[PDB]
Design a protein around this nucleic acid. Structure first.
Ligand SMILES: [Mg+2]
Ligand SMILES: [Mg+2]
Ligand SMILES: [Mg+2]
Ligand SMILES: [Mg+2]
Ligand SMILES: [Mg+2]
Ligand SMILES: [Mg+2]
Ligand SMILES: [Mg+2]
Ligand SMILES: [Mg+2]
Ligand SMILES: [Mg+2]
Ligand SMILES: [Mg+2]
Ligand SMILES: [Mg+2]
Ligand SMILES: [Mg+2]
Ligand SMILES: [Mg+2]
Ligand SMILES: [Mg+2]
Ligand SMILES: [Mg+2]
Ligand SMILES: [Mg+2]
Ligand SMILES: [Mg+2]
Ligand SMILES: [Mg+2]
Ligand SMILES: [Mg+2]
Ligand SMILES: [Mg+2]
Ligand SMILES: [Mg+2]
Ligand SMILES: [Mg+2]
Ligand SMILES: [Mg+2]
Ligand SMILES: [Mg+2]
Ligand SMILES: [Mg+2]
Ligand SMILES: [Mg+2]
Ligand SMILES: [Mg+2]
Ligand SMILES: [Mg+2]
Ligand SMILES: [Mg+2]
Ligand SMILES: [Mg+2]
Ligand SMILES: [Mg+2]
Ligand SMILES: [Mg+2]
Ligand SMILES: [Mg+2]
Ligand SMILES: [Mg+2]
Ligand SMILES: [Mg+2]
Ligand SMILES: [Mg+2]
Ligand SMILES: [Mg+2]
Ligand SMILES: [Mg+2]
Ligand SMILES: [Mg+2]
Ligand SMILES: [Mg+2]
Ligand SMILES: [Mg+2]
Ligand SMILES: [Mg+2]
Ligand SMILES: [Mg+2]
Ligand SMILES: [Mg+2]
Ligand SMILES: [Mg+2]
Ligand SMILES: [Mg+2]
Ligand SMILES: [Mg+2]
Ligand SMILES: [Mg+2]
Ligand SMILES: [Mg+2]
Ligand SMILES: [Mg+2]
Ligand SMILES: [Mg+2]
Ligand SMILES: [Mg+2]
Ligand SMILES: [Mg+2]
Ligand SMILES: [Mg+2]
Ligand SMILES: [Mg+2]
Ligand SMILES: [Mg+2]
Ligand SMILES: [Mg+2]
Ligand SMILES: [Mg+2]
Ligand SMILES: [Mg+2]
Ligand SMILES: [Mg+2]
Ligand SMILES: [Mg+2]
Ligand SMILES: [Mg+2]
Ligand SMILES: [Mg+2]
Ligand SMILES: [Mg+2]
Ligand SMILES: [Mg+2]
Ligand SMILES: [Mg+2]
Ligand SMILES: [Mg+2]
Lengths: 144, 62, 124, 207
RNA sequence: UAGACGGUGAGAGCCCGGUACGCGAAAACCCGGCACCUGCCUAGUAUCAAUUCCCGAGUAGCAGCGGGCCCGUGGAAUCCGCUGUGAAUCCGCCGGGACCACCCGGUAAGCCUAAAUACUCCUCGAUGACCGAUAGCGGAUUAGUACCGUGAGGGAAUGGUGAAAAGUACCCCGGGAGGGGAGUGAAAGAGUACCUGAAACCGUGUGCCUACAAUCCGUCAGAGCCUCCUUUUCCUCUCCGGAGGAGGGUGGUGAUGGCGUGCCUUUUGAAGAAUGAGCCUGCGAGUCAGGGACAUGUCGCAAGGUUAACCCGUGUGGGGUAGCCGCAGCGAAAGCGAGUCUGAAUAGGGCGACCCACACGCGCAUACGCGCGUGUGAAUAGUGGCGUGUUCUGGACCCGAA
RNA sequence: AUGCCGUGGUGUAAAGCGUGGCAGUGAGACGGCGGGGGAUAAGCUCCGUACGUCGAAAGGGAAACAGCCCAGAUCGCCGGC
RNA sequence: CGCGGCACAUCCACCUUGUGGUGGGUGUGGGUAGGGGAGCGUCCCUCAUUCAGCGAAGCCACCGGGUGACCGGUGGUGGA
């Protein structure tokens, strides 16, 4: 039988807490600070480099904007159309979600990394150039 | 109390595909007459942020 | 949970003021001065349990040097004579023979005298 | 694996089979210690307060001149080194509700019921009391013919108010719904006593 | 159907108030139904013409100066204020981030509106890995009282006899206060100064040392005296009782020799003639909140992991796919995609992908695996809990100004 | 003369280099040697030095002694060199 | 240097063969700021077990114990 005086945590998952400022036998009077300066009573900010013009005002801005209308696409390679579907059949946008290779409520796009032998028949948005030649080379077809 | 990222260093540092931090190079905005073309060309592109200043740039983007 | 600090704290106070009996002044009645004395009283024993190896030796040398000169040889020439004849008796026991039995320390002199080189000032 | 249903003042009428993916999971010690701890933390009411130096009443002025007297400068009469000042890093009201995943909770309950069923402790009874009015002298005797141990968890249905009233005031008997089995309560008990209407509700909630 | 909690001369379901579970309201107020009462409707509807009328005025638009929105006057739209100018009623007017044109959406300048939500001076009923008298409200005690201030305001300290007062009848010393003997009680080692009664500090009795000595007060050597428990060999009163000395040992003291510059902070360096402490007792300083940020330990599931609000539960239990992070990168971006950007370039770079130790296979090569194979099944791996170190925002380790 | 850069031997456990966590430190002091400013004064100042000690190092020696000489304390010992 | 006690690091043989113990080699252990590793004592809760008006806590003395914080036994006081 397992009772509550037989349960114990895994060896190493509960290590003791470092209580600091409690004697010369441990981290003593200064509690790991030592100094007599800003570090001994306050915090120094990260953005501050002692006065000179910092690392984020010497280097210039990264060039250019971000597109407000960049319609992205999700990605499934043609090498995982093979392994997930080893006997062919229709490959819609819906069945790729349930097999776990693409996200819900997004747009799919089949790329061409890998080898394809099974006669798949995939429907998607906006196929690659190298995916219409690894699918039609196995009797498949690529619709919209 | 949700942690803010630094609003200026996110315009001067971006990330590549393997966790590197890249940036641009200076001395290329103005006064470009007396700079020959073997100097304006060295300052083109993007370099990896140096190995001694990668802790203060991680803790500004994050 | 709030803890009154008192049952824990009175434990390093009783065992200083038991090891501080016999002292005179504030150094046996108060905790803050008996702790300052125990820091000095235990260092003066670590300093002196190592010094007293060299302080009983310093007395055995003087007791041999006294009883050597009742048999007209110096301590400079008794230890040479005992190392030459191969008598590895340490100086604690070589002193306690000289006190407690004078007719046995004499026979350790007449061995160290006879086993000494003939010209002690000659280069060898 | 095969637990026979008993009857109040009677005999064995049937048998109810305990499925293996619900009563023969291996007993993982280092997981049930985290589900038990994350449950007593949710029982902490977390109502404890003290006052800082900014909420202890008064203390607004500076009491005397900083240079001139020979006393130490003090700044406020309610700073935390005064007798009667605020408490520094005192307790505030806190919540302790840990956020354990669902699979770590379900697979620690199923490891708790399995460890009782492996040693022959899961019992099944058809009802505690054979009437509709409650009674304790019968249900104490009926749980004494099952077990002779100090801790019993009696899982009966929610709408069985005739027998739920019959085991409220027994010393060392806990009462919970079939959909309220948790890890801290099985592990306190020695002997889990289901109902044949209650065990079929727990098995058919997990296929 | 009562083992909640408290009281009773100590840990009580069966002694008591009660709890579980039932019963109860003259009158008052709250709510609900039916009546009375009060109001409303009982003339329009459908097709059709498209001429005319109307559809909220010093309002909208535009302009000047401001306010506020992610938006600090900027290319500045929607929205509001003041000052000028000041239309139109469906072919009307306004918005869709200057602006025009086309399209889609909508009818400003009149009004009213439950629910979801914020709060607790107060009322009753529950609860605490909250406090137990320097804590907890300032306030368990004349408590916003005494006291301080002209005033606004500031603002304390003080709880415990015993189960029951049974609170020491009576006698003695004393003016009394206080004691002693008696007594009450289990206890006066509980006497209205009162449970337990520590420490500083203050007496008294006693063993040892101390009036020729220069002492961070100790420590190592070390004699002598006193005290208490014991083997030996004796006195043998011996069942005695351990009578006395010698030897050994615990405890106290320490004549006397050697070494020895208190603690703390700050410093190049302190015994210090640098700073702090009269002594004791209590109190007084890296703590919390967040699915935060980075690492690391550990448990779960694993190409997936996980839920938030919320819902149903007498709880810690069960549901909940919105979402977040992983799943493919390059680019300023259109984009293209195991590749992409620069470029006139299948030139070179930048970032990113890409497995062998084989056999077989191999235009086979002296040899050596490059190109390519079914497995011989090279090892990738993330996400979510709880711990620890550091950190970000908040008072953020604590005290301190003018 | 030394010192430094590279390579081939021999020797050496607690050397190095790369990448993360966490730091402290950035007021030094005197002594030996080499030089500047000063008056070849200074317990003066500012430098160099795979130079030392102190700092952060007790013990023995220089009468006493942060910095000089000898030597680096794990604890015991009424033991030797 | 000689004889005993303790600790760390590596090496050599052995067993679940690092979740580690056993056995002998050799080296090593002054330390401020500081980093890492492992523990003692007080108080609260839960599970199990045990002692308590035949005297708990707390407080005082004495005889002992552990490498350190500190711990135990007996007596006295006292009253949950
Ligand atoms: Mg200190
Ligand atoms: Mg510093
Ligand atoms: Mg400084
Ligand atoms: Mg300081
Ligand atoms: Mg400047
Ligand atoms: Mg430019
Ligand atoms: Mg040019
Ligand atoms: Mg003395
Ligand atoms: Mg010596
Ligand atoms: Mg205030
Ligand atoms: Mg102030
Ligand atoms: Mg207070
Ligand atoms: Mg849940
Ligand atoms: Mg009770
Ligand atoms: Mg009753
Ligand atoms: Mg209108
Ligand atoms: Mg306007
Ligand atoms: Mg504005
Ligand atoms: Mg527009
Ligand atoms: Mg309207
Ligand atoms: Mg309104
Ligand atoms: Mg409302
Ligand atoms: Mg309310
Ligand atoms: Mg209330
Ligand atoms: Mg108070
Ligand atoms: Mg008290
Ligand atoms: Mg007045
Ligand atoms: Mg009297
Ligand atoms: Mg009396
Ligand atoms: Mg009596
Ligand atoms: Mg009694
Ligand atoms: Mg008593
Ligand atoms: Mg008193
Ligand atoms: Mg008293
Ligand atoms: Mg004298
Ligand atoms: Mg003198
Ligand atoms: Mg002396
Ligand atoms: Mg100075
Ligand atoms: Mg210093
Ligand atoms: Mg002085
Ligand atoms: Mg001083
Ligand atoms: Mg002073
Ligand atoms: Mg003080
Ligand atoms: Mg104190
Ligand atoms: Mg990008
Ligand atoms: Mg390329
Ligand atoms: Mg915590
Ligand atoms: Mg500086
Ligand atoms: Mg400097
Ligand atoms: Mg220098
Ligand atoms: Mg020099
Ligand atoms: Mg010189
Ligand atoms: Mg100088
Ligand atoms: Mg100087
Ligand atoms: Mg020295
Ligand atoms: Mg050194
Ligand atoms: Mg010296
Ligand atoms: Mg000397
Ligand atoms: Mg010699
Ligand atoms: Mg050390
Ligand atoms: Mg050493
Ligand atoms: Mg340290
Ligand atoms: Mg007693
Ligand atoms: Mg207690
Ligand atoms: Mg003790
Ligand atoms: Mg006792
Ligand atoms: Mg006691």
């Amino acid at each position: 039988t397992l009772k509550l005086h037989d349960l114990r945590p895994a060896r190493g998952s509960k290590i003791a807490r470092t209580r600091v400022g409690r004697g010369d036998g441990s981290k003593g009077k200064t509690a790991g600070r030592g100094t007599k300066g800003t570090r001994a009573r306050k915090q120094v900010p990260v953005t501050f480099e002692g006065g000179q013009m910092p690392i984020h005002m010497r280097l210039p801005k990264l060039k250019g904007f971000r597109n407000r209308f960049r319609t992205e696409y999700e990605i499934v390679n043609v090498g995982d159309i093979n392994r997930l579907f080893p006997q062919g059949g229709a490959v819609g946008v819906d069945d790729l979600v349930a097999k776990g290779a693409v996200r819900k409520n997004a747009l799919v796009k089949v790329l061409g990394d890998g080898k394809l032998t099974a006669k798949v028949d995939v429907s998607a948005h906006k196929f690659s150039g190298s995916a219409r030649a690894k699918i039609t080379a196995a009797g498949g077809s690529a619709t919209e | 109390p949700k942690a803010k990222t630094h609003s200026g260093a996110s315009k001067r540092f971006r990330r590549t595909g393997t966790g590197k931090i890249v940036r641009q190079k200076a001395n290329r905005r103005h006064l470009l007459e007396h700079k020959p073309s073997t100097r304006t060309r060295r300052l083109d592109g993007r370099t990896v942020v140096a190995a001694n200043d990668t802790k203060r740039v991680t803790s500004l983007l994050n | 949970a709030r803890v009154k600090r008192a049952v824990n704290a009175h434990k390093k106070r009783r065992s200083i003021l038991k090891a501080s009996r016999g002292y005179r002044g504030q150094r046996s009645r108060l905790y803050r001065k008996a702790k300052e004395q125990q820091l000095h009283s235990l260092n003066y024993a670590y300093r002196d349990r190592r010094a007293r190896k060299g302080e009983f030796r310093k007395l055995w040398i003087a007791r041999i040097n006294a009883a050597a000169r009742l048999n007209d040889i110096t301590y400079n020439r008794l230890i040479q004579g005992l190392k030459a004849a191969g008598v590895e008796v340490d100086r604690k026991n070589l002193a306690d023979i000289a006190i407690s039995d004078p007719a046995a320390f004499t026979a350790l002199v007449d061995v160290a005298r006879a086993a000494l080189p003939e010209d002690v000032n000659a280069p060898s | 694996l095969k637990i026979d249903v008993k009857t109040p003042a009677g005999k064995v009428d049937g048998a109810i089979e305990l499925p293996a993916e619900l009563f023969d999971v291996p007993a993982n010690i280092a997981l049930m210690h985290q589900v038990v701890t994350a449950q007593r933390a949710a029982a902490r009411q977390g109502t404890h307060s003290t006052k800082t130096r900014g909420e202890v009443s008064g203390g607004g002025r500076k009491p005397y001149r900083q240079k001139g007297t020979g006393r130490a400068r003090q700044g406020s009469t309610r700073a935390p080194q005064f007798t009667g000042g605020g408490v520094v890093h005192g307790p505030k009201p806190r919540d302790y509700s840990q956020r354990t995943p669902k699979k770590m909770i379900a697979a620690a309950l199923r490891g708790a019921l399995s460890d009782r069923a492996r040693n022959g402790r899961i019992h099944a009874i058809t009802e505690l009391v054979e009437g509709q009015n409650p009674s304790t002298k019968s249900a104490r005797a009926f749980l004494a013919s099952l077990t002779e141990r100090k801790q019993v968890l009696v899982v009966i249905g929610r709408s069985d108010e005739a027998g739920a009233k019959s085991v409220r005031n027994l010393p060392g008997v806990h009462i919970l719904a079939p959909d309220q089995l948790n890890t801290y309560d099985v592990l306190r008990a020695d002997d889990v006593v289901f109902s044949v209407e209650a065990l079929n509700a727990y098995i058919a909630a997990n296929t």
